[PDB]
Each structure stands twice: as structure tokens, then as C-alpha cells.
Amino acid sequence: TEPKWYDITVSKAKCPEEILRKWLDENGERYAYGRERYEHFQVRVVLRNPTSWETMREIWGNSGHCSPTSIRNFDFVLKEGDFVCSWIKVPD
Ligand SMILES: [Mn+2]
Ligand code: NA
Ligand code: NA
């Protein structure tokens, strides 16, 4: 089965946040991302559909660098910072 869990490092200069967010909403069942400085979005996503790594590499091109992940959690958002999550938190 092709992977569903991917980490992606997305270049903001090549992919504005709103384009990334729309793609994540359309293609991810669950996702979260942070920002690290050229600013990059550091994404983890579980895709709705199994998708080959080669497909992911082609559709992101040099705008993002992706890799299937064996990690199965979004707990990086528990650290300090401003993160975007696909689900609703208590203060949202
Ligand atoms: Mn969604
Ligand atoms: Na958080
Ligand atoms: Na949230």
C-alpha cells in the first residue's frame, strides 16, 4: 500500500500559505504545520488516499521537499509556537 503519512517542508516563496492550506484541506484527512526561517512551512499530513512517493515528489517539485514518515502523531504542536492544525482545539 502506498503511504498516507508524509512530512513536507514547503517553501513559502514558492507556495503561499493559502495554496498549501487549500491543498491540505482537499487532500489530507488530518494535518498540522509550523513555520521555520526564506520561511518554510513544516508540515505533517495523513492523506485521504494512499499516494506514491514519486507522485508526491512530482506534484511538489522544488516548491516542497517531502518524505513518507513512520511517525504517527502531531505532538510537535505541543511545543511553544504558533501552529496551524486541521482539528479544533479548546481555545479555537
Ligand atoms: Mn480536512
Ligand atoms: Na498547538
Ligand atoms: Na486548531
TrEMBL record:
Residues of the full protein shown: 2 to 97 of 248
Name of this chain's protein: Rep
Superkingdom of this protein's organism: Viruses
